[PDB]
Every structure is written in structure tokens, then in C-alpha cells.
Amino acid sequence: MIGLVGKKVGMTRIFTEDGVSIPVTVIEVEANRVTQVKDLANDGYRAIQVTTGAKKANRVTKPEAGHFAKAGVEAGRGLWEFRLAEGEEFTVGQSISVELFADVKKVDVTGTSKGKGFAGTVKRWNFRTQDATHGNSLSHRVPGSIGQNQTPGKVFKGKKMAGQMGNERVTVQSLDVVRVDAERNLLLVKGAVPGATGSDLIVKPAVKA
Amino acid sequence: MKVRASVKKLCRNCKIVKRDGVIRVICSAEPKHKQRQG
Amino acid sequence: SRVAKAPVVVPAGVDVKINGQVITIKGKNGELTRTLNDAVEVKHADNTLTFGPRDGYADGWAQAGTARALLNSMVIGVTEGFTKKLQLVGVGYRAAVKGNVINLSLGFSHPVDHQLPAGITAECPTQTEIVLKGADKQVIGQVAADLRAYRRPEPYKGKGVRYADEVVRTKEAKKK
Amino acid sequence: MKTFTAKPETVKRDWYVVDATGKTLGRLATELARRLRGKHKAEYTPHVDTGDYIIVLNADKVAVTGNKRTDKVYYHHTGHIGGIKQATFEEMIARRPERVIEIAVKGMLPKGPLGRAMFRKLKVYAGNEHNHAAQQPQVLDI
RNA sequence: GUGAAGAGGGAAACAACCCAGACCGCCAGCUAAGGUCCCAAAGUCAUGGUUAAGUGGGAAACGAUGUGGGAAGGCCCAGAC
RNA sequence: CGAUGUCGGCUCAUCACAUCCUGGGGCUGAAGUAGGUCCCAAGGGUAUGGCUGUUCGCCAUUUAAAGUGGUACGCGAGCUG
RNA sequence: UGCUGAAAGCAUCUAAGCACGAAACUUGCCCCGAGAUGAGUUCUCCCUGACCCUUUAAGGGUCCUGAAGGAACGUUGAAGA
Numbered sequence: 001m002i003g004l005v006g007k008k009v010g011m012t013r014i015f016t017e018d019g020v021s022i023p024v025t026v027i028e029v030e031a032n033r034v035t036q037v038k039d040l041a042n043d044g045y046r047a048i049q050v051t052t053g054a055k056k057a058n059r060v061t062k063p064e065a066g067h068f069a070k071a072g073v074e075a076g077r078g079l080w081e082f083r084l085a086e087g088e089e090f091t092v093g094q095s096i097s098v099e100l101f102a103d104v105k106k107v108d109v110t111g112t113s114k115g116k117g118f119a120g121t122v123k124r125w126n127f128r129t130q131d132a133t134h135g136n137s138l139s140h141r142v143p144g145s146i147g148q149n150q151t152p153g154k155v156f157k158g159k160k161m162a163g164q165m166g167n168e169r170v171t172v173q174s175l176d177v178v179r180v181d182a183e184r185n186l187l188l189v190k191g192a193v194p195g196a197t198g199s200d201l202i203v204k205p206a207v208k209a
Numbered sequence: 210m211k212v213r214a215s216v217k218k219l220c221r222n223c224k225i226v227k228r229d230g231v232i233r234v235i236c237s238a239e240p241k242h243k244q245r246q247g
Numbered sequence: 248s249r250v251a252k253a254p255v256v257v258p259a260g261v262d263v264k265i266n267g268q269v270i271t272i273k274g275k276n277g278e279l280t281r282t283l284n285d286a287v288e289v290k291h292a293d294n295t296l297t298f299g300p301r302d303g304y305a306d307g308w309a310q311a312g313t314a315r316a317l318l319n320s321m322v323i324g325v326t327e328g329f330t331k332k333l334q335l336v337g338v339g340y341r342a343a344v345k346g347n348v349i350n351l352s353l354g355f356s357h358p359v360d361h362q363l364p365a366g367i368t369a370e371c372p373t374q375t376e377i378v379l380k381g382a383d384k385q386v387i388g389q390v391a392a393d394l395r396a397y398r399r400p401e402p403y404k405g406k407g408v409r410y411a412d413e414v415v416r417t418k419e420a421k422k423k
Numbered sequence: 424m425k426t427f428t429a430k431p432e433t434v435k436r437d438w439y440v441v442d443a444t445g446k447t448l449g450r451l452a453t454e455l456a457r458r459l460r461g462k463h464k465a466e467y468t469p470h471v472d473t474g475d476y477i478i479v480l481n482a483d484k485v486a487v488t489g490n491k492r493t494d495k496v497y498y499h500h501t502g503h504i505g506g507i508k509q510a511t512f513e514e515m516i517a518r519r520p521e522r523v524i525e526i527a528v529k530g531m532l533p534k535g536p537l538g539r540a541m542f543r544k545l546k547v548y549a550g551n552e553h554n555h556a557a558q559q560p561q562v563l564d565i
Numbered sequence: 566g567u568g569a570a571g572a573g574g575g576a577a578a579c580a581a582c583c584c585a586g587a588c589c590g591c592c593a594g595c596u597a598a599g600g601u602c603c604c605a606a607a608g609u610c611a612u613g614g615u616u617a618a619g620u621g622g623g624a625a626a627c628g629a630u631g632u633g634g635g636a637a638g639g640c641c642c643a644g645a646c
Numbered sequence: 647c648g649a650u651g652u653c654g655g656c657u658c659a660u661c662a663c664a665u666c667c668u669g670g671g672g673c674u675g676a677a678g679u680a681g682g683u684c685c686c687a688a689g690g691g692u693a694u695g696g697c698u699g700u701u702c703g704c705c706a707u708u709u710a711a712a713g714u715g716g717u718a719c720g721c722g723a724g725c726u727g
Numbered sequence: 728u729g730c731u732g733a734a735a736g737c738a739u740c741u742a743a744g745c746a747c748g749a750a751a752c753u754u755g756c757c758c759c760g761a762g763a764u765g766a767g768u769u770c771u772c773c774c775u776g777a778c779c780c781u782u783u784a785a786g787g788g789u790c791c792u793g794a795a796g797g798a799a800c801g802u803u804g805a806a807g808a
Contacts, residue, residue, distance in 0.1 A: 035770095036769085036770065038769075038770095042768095042769070043768070043769055044768075044769095049770090061771095061772080061795080061796075062771080062772045062773075062795060062796085063770090063771045063772040063773090063795075063796085064771075064772085065771085065772085066770090066771045066772050067770060067771045067772085068771095069771090070770075070771070071770095114805060114806095115805080115806055115807075117806085117807060117808080118807085118808065121658090127657075127658075128656095128657070128658095129657085130656060130657050130724090130725060130726090131656070131657095131725080131726080134656095134726075135725080135726050135727075136656090136725055136726070137725065137726080138725085139657085139724060139725045139726095140725090142657080142724065142725080143657075143658065143724075144656080144657030144658040144659085144721080144724055144725080145657065145658045145659070145720085145721040145724055145725095146658065146659085146721085146724075147658085147659070147660080147720080147721075148659075148660070148717055148718090148720040148721065149717070149718050149720055149721070150650095150717095150718060150720095151716090151717055151718080151720080152660085152717080152720095156503070156504040156659085156660070157502055157503045157504060158503055158504075159658090159659085160658085160659095164807095166806095167806065167807090168758080168759090169757090169758065169759090170757080170758080171756095171757060171758085173756080173757080195805085196805035197805070198805085199805085207755090207756070208756070210672045210673060210684080210685080211672090211673075211684075212672095212684065212685060213628085214626095214627065214628065215627055215628045215629090216628060216629070217628075217629090224738075224739080225629065225630070226630095226739060226740090226741095227629075227630085227631075227741095228739095228740065228741065229740095229741080230618080230631090232628070232629045235739080237738095240672085240673065240674095241673060241674080243672075243673075245672090245685080246628090246685095247627090247628040247629050248733085248734065248735075248736080249735085249736035250733065250734090250735095250736055251733085251734095251736095252736085253736075281744085282744090283743085284743045284744085285743090286743080287743090306734070306742065306743085308733090308734070309733055309734035309735095309742065309743085310733080310734090310742080310743060311733085311734095312732085312733040312734065312735095312736090313731090313732050313733045313734090313742090313743060313744085314733090314743085315733080316731085316732060316733065317731075317732070317733095317743095317744090320731075320732090383731090384730090384731060385730050385731035385732085385744085385745065385746095386730085386731090386745095387730095388729090388730045388731060389729085389730045389731080389745075389746060390730090391730085392728095392729055392730055392746085392747095393729095393730095393746080393747085395729095396728080396729080396747080399728095401677095402676085403676085403677055404677080418676095419677090420676090420677045421674095421675065421676080421677080422675090424592085425592065426592055449602075449603085450602075450609075452602095452603075453602050453603045453609075454602090454603090454609090455603095456602095456603045456604080457602090457603065460603085460604095462603090489617070489618095489619070490617090490618095490619085491619080494619080495619090504660070504661080505660085505661070509752085510752095510753085514752090514753070517753095518753085527603095528603090530603085530604080531602090531603040531604060532603080532604070533603095533604055533605085534604075538604085543765080
């Protein structure tokens with residue numbers, strides 16, 4: 001089905017009754033409220049665009065405010081879009097709550113991971129370090145060789161070298177949802193999800209079987 | 210079966226058939242006589 | 248050639264419709280319809296069915312022969328029908344029919360359920376016989392080949408789903 | 424005097440619609456390449472795009488002879504190393520048949536900036552209708 | 566014989582292979598090798614065959630009811646295969 | 647030859663398939679288990695140590711397996727020496 | 728591996744037709760992605776003045792206006808050379 005947009009609140013644990021600690025991530029999922037519905041007859045695909053949270057009145061621009069004003073909804077902190085599953089139906093301005101996950105049993109959580117900046121190939125690609133002694137001259141963490149010789153005389157595409165690690169979309173699949181709390185607007189999933197605390201998540205039901 | 214480049218009738222029940230541009234020897238008596246690729 | 252030259256004698260009460268290349272034959276057993284090759288010209292001529300090579304095509308004789316035999320089978324498939332008979336050799340091999348699903352117990356860790364297609368009706372007079380009947384010949388040949396294909400006749404003992412007419416040749420172990 | 428040269432500001436060029444049902448791929452392709460160069464016009468000039476706009480339609484219904492329906496293989500390499508990627512003719516007709524006619528014509532047209540400009544005039548569709556009713560394409564029976 | 570010391574056209578590209586030997590000029594004609602569906606000048610020419618393998622567009626001993634042609638021969642409507 | 651650094655180790659690969667494992671299958675002198683042999687298959691995977699400068703090899707103990715080759719016997723403006 | 732089936736009155740998985748069939752192939756899963764110059768789609772927001780000149784054109788210039796928004800600046804960040 002569709003998913004909901006959360007916010008990574010942090011991690012805790014949930015002691016079970018038989019004494020098994022479960023590492024959970026707390027995801028506050030407020031009222032995701034639908035701002036646009038997309039049909040084949042106008043867009044070629046069925047999908048809903050939701051917003052969540054709240055934004056300052058002076059910080060939302062006039063394009064954006066006109067969009068949310070047409071939808072008849074309070075401006076949120078962003079717009080996201082979920083593809084619909086052929087028998088689902090939503091209306092504009094409809095609110096969607098964490099209660100949707102009261103049946104789902106296992107979810108997939110998509111966020112932007114923590115940006116580690118320009119990372120070298122030992123951090124980035126798990127290259128193995130060369131000797132730390134035994135003669136080695138200024139080449140301890142360096143990548144080694146990068147290709148062959150006259151044949152090809154080029155470095156191939158997607159050679160693993162150093163550069164920006166982190167700060168990109170990653171999806172963690174098949175996380176066990178531990179609690180759905182409709183009162184406090186919370187979703188407790190088992191495990192770590194991507195992102196620092198306060199980062200926006202996207203929690204969908206698991207597509208894997 | 211036997212992929213050879215000379216396929217032959219080893220028995221009197223063996224039978225040469227061309228399937229999909231491939232010469233084959235189909236036997237009914239002995240399945241060891243089944244051959245391909247002549 | 249020698250097959251295409253002999254005419255198909257169509258018996259009474261059998262409906263033959265020649266819509267160009269499409270041939271519909273409907274008798275007492277069911278409507279059954281083919282579409283011949285373009286190299287076959289078929290002519291009724293009020294009594295029988297006659298098959299000839301359409302002029303301008305190289306292998307048309309060969310094609311004509313096939314059309315012949317196919318329609319011959321179709322005539323039997325609207326008059327008497329075709330019947331394959333399979334038997335299950337092995338300790339604890341079971342066959343049953345629920346609706347048109349053949350349940351089979353063939354020494355597996357999971358039940359076998361073969362869905363028969365539309366035109367075919369199987370029976371089981373015994374636990375170790377499947378007598379299946381139908382109108383189209385390749386379809387019951389197909390289905391009998393599938394049921395055989397679940398557990399093929401093992402060579403040393405004979406255990407498997409065999410045809411009732413087919414002989415299964417056996418052999419002994421290596422030594423002793 | 425000097426030999427006439429067509430001037431690309433003043434080239435008049437027409438719109439043609441061609442139904443590609445049951446045509447042979449290379450033989451249609453060669454006729455389209457001739458019409459898109461402008462080789463059929465007496466004002467042909469090798470550095471001026473003088474050709475016509477052709478709307479090919481029913482591109483998924485194009486025919487090939489022999490076993491080329493299954494044996495004709497379209498290779499391309501992706502730039503990444505082991506990136507040799509093949510696709511037979513029927514796989515291409517299933518995925519995008521426009522690519523079949525467009526690959527053929529593109530390989531028959533001169534390579535270079537001009538022949539890219541010549542290929543921009545070919546408009547291929549997999550169906551029977553086109554958006555270009557405003558340009559009034561007359562039916563080129565070829 | 567050519568290259569060396571020889572350009573030009575052809576063989577994709579290719580000293581030495583095929584055609585041919587450049588005094589200069591010309592937005593003139595005819596040709597050689599090689600070619601005429603499109604890139605790319607010129608036959609998607611005419612008549613009669615052959616192959617379906619993309620053979621054409623690598624590769625042998627050897628294998629094979631692929632297929633077109635030719636000359637014979639055994640049996641055969643006292644009925645052959 | 648007005649310089650194209652040449653074994654081995656390390657780091658980092660990459661392609662071929664004449665396949666070591668895993669996957670499909672035919673024959674078996676294939677009862678089962680385990681095999682032998684041949685066809686298909688390149689997705690991914692495909693040891694740690696003693697000795698030796700060694701590649702190799704022998705040995706020890708693993709492993710589903712410890713593939714065979716090409717890549718300047720890949721890789722010294724990347725390291726060692 | 729077959730089913731039906733002739734050429735070859737039999738046989739035959741193939742020539743017409745039909746069904747299975749593997750980690751390879753195309754998808755399914757994850758990420759990038761309209762410079763996809765073939766530059767796409769959808770929603771929303773903003774701008775509704777006069778007047779001269781000429782070799783009268785998607786031409787040049789003067790005055791009045793300066794929107795949506797962006798950029799700069801600052802406080803900065805689990806973003807960052």
C-alpha cells in the first residue's frame with residue numbers, strides 16, 4: 001500500500017515480558033495529509049502527494065502556499081508522493097495517521113543517511129590497508145593500483161575510488177514494526193533506520209515476501 | 210548421450226533424425242545409442 | 248502424399264464449416280476448430296473432406312498430409328472421442344479426481360494436484376488407474392505426458408506413472 | 424556561372440505519413456533515408472537539409488524475412504566495463520519498436536551534425552494515430 | 566614487376582597487391598580496376614537457375630533420408646516398397 | 647639501445663570459458679548413498695598456515711569449492727626490494 | 728524432455744502447430760536519472776504602463792515601474808575540502 005512520512009526521534013529499547021531487549025527506532029508519524037491526487041487521465045499514474053508537520057507562515061513561498069491553499073490544507077514541511085496500488089482511493093485534504101500500520105507486521109524505512117563527507121577508500125569501499133611498516137613508503141591507506149597496463153590504458157568506469165560517502169537515499173528493508181501508538185503518533189520499528197535524529201523518514205509496507 | 214562429430218547407426222533400431230538443424234541418432238533398443246551433432 | 252491423397256470420410260451428423268483456412272468441426276462430442284496452413288486447400292464436395300496442396304507453395308504436399316491426419320483425428324474427436332489410460336506402479340501411489348483436479352500421491356513430501364484443462368475429463372476406476380477421456384488428441388496426449396512427467400517410470404523396478412500400453416524395460420543392479 | 428546551392432532559410436519541405444505495416448525493415452528504411460536526406464529533390468545539396476518530414480506509423484508491425492525475427496540481435500555497450508548488452512528483434516518490438524525503425528534509418532543517414540538534423544525529421548509511432556494532424560501529412564505510399 | 570625515388574582511383578583503413586604513370590589551368594566529356602539499396606557517384610536493371618545456412622560475410626579429416634541436376638540399375642498392377 | 651624498469655610479495659582489479667563450487671540435463675558397467683563421463687550454464691563464490699626470495703611444490707588443518715587462462719608472464723609517475 | 732503430426736500410406740519432438748525447461752537473459756528488489764538537446768509531465772505563484780527614432784525588424788532607445796522569486800549578508804547545521 002502507500003506509506004507515511006515520519007521523523008527519526010531516536011533509539012531506545014523495549015524490554016519484552018520474557019526479558020528480551022529489542023532495539024527499536026522511534027519514528028513520530030504525525031497526520032500526513034493529502035495535498036494532491038494523481039490520476040491516469042491527467043498524469044499517467046495514480047499517486048497521492050502528502051505533506052506533514054507544519055511550516056512557518058512567512059517561510060512558505062507563494063507558489064507553495066497556493067498549492068496547499070488549493071488543497072484546503074495547512075502547509076507542511078515538505079511534499080512527498082506515494083504510488084497507489086490499483087484499488088486504493090484517497091481524497092484531497094484527507095488525513096492519514098499511523099493507524100494505517102496497525103496490521104502491517106513488517107515495513108521498509110527510507111531516509112537519507114548520515115553524511116560522512118569526502119571519505120577515502122578504506123572507509124568508503126573497505127579496501128584493505130597495506131603494511132604499516134616493513135619498508136612501506138608513504139602508502140599506507142592509499143588505494144594501490146587502479147588498473148592494468150597498455151591494454152586498456154584507461155581506468156574502467158565505476159572503479160572504486162575515494163569521494164563523498166554518506167548523505168544519500170538508503171532504504172532499509174523488512175524491519176519488524178514493534179508498536180503502533182495512535183495516541184502519541186509513534187511507530188516503533190525493530191532496528192536502526194537511516195539518518196541522524198530528526199531526519200525525515202518514509203515508512204512503507206514491505207514489498208518483500 | 211554421445212556428442213560426436215561422426216554420428217552413425219550402431220544398431221538396426223537406430224534412426225537418423227535431423228531436429229533443429231542437428232543430426233541425431235535416436236534408438237529404441239538401447240539408449241546408449243542416442244547420439245548428437247554429426 | 249499417400250496420406251493427403253486419401254479423403255476424410257465425414258460421418259452423419261457432423262458439422263463442417265470452412266471459413267477460408269479456419270475449419271470448425273462440431274459433432275456429438277464437441278466443437279473443435281483448427282486453422283490450417285496456407286499451403287493446404289481443403290474442399291468438402293458434399294460427401295467427404297478432400298485435401299490438396301495450394302498451388303505456388305513448395306512443401307504443400309507435406310502440409311496437406313498433416314492437415315489430413317489432423318482432421319481425421321478431429322472427426323474421431325467428434326464421433327467417438329479419444330481415451331488415454333495411465334497406471335501407477337509403486338507402493339502407495341494414489342490417484343483421485345476432485346472435479347477436474349487429479350490428486351496424485353507419488354511418494355513426495357507434498358501433494359500433487361494436476362489441473363486438467365477445459366476439454367478433458369479423467370476418471371479413476373481404481374486407485375492405480377487414470378482413464379482420461381476427451382475430444383482433442385494432442386490435448387489428451389499432452390495431459391497424459393504431464394501426468395507421466397511427474398514421476399516417470401524408474402528403470403530398475405518399474406515405479407512410476409506409466410501408460411497402460413507402453414512397455415517399461417528393466418534391468419538389474421550392478422553386481423548382486 | 425556557379426552551380427545552384429539550396430539555401431536552408433528558403434527550403435520548402437513537406438510532411439508525409441507512411442504506414443509501416445508489413446513492410447520489410449531495410450527496404451522501408453532505405454526509402455525513408457532517401458526522403459530525409461532530400462535525395463529525391465532536384466535542389467539536393469549535400470550540406471543542406473532539404474528533405475521532408477516523415478511520420479512513420481505502425482512501427483511494431485514491421486516485418487523481416489528469414490529468422491531475423493529471433494536471430495537479429497541489437498548489441499550496445501553501456502560504457503561500464505562488462506556492459507555488452509544484446510536484445511533480439513522480438514524483444515525490441517516488445518519493449519520499444521520505435522527503436523527498431525529509428526536504429527535502421529539512423530544507420531542509413533550520414534553521420535555528423537547534418538545527419539542528426541536529418542534524423543530529427545523522422546517521427547515514428549508504434550500505433551495508428553499521430554498528434555501531427557495540424558501539419559497535414561499527405562499519405563506517402565511507400 | 567612495383568616500392569625505394571610515383572602521386573591519382575580501387576582493395577574499409579593498408580610502401581610493396583589490382584588499375585594507372587601527376588608540366589599548369591577548366592563548376593567539360595569518355596573510360597580502366599572496381600562498382601550501381603542507404604551512408605556513398607551510378608541498375609532497389611532484364612532473362613533463367615541455385616541456397617535458406619545470414620551461407621554469402623574464417624577453419625579440415627570425417628558425419629548426415631538438407632536440397633537442385635545427370636546417366637544408369639534391382640524389384641513392380643502373374644501386385645513390388 | 648638520444649632507456650619500453652623484467653622475478654616474487656602487497657594493494658587494487660578486470661575479461662575469457664576449455665567450469666572448481668552452486669544451478670539444469672543425457673548415458674552409465676546409475677538399487678540407494680556416493681560416483682564416472684558428456685552436454686548446457688560465467689549470476690555470485692572460489693582458504694589459513696610451516697618451509698623456501700621463490701611462482702611452483704611438499705606438508706598441516708580447513709572448505710560448497712580452494713578453477714584454468716588473458717590483461718607489458720595486469721599492477722614499481724601505487725608500495726616493497 | 729515431450730504432445731499432435733506429415734514429407735517417407737510406418738516411424739518421427741518439427742517441416743505447419745503446441746507444452747515444459749537453469750543461479751545465465753528481460754523484469755521483480757535498491758540507488759542515480761530530462762544536458763532523455765528526443766531537454767517530458769503535473770500543480771501553484773507573479774508581471775495587464777506611456778512615448779520617440781529608423782537602414783520597419785521576434786529592431787533600437789527614453790521615462791515610469793522592479794512583481795513571484797533569487798542572490799548577497801548574518802546566526803549556523805548529526806551538511807561540508
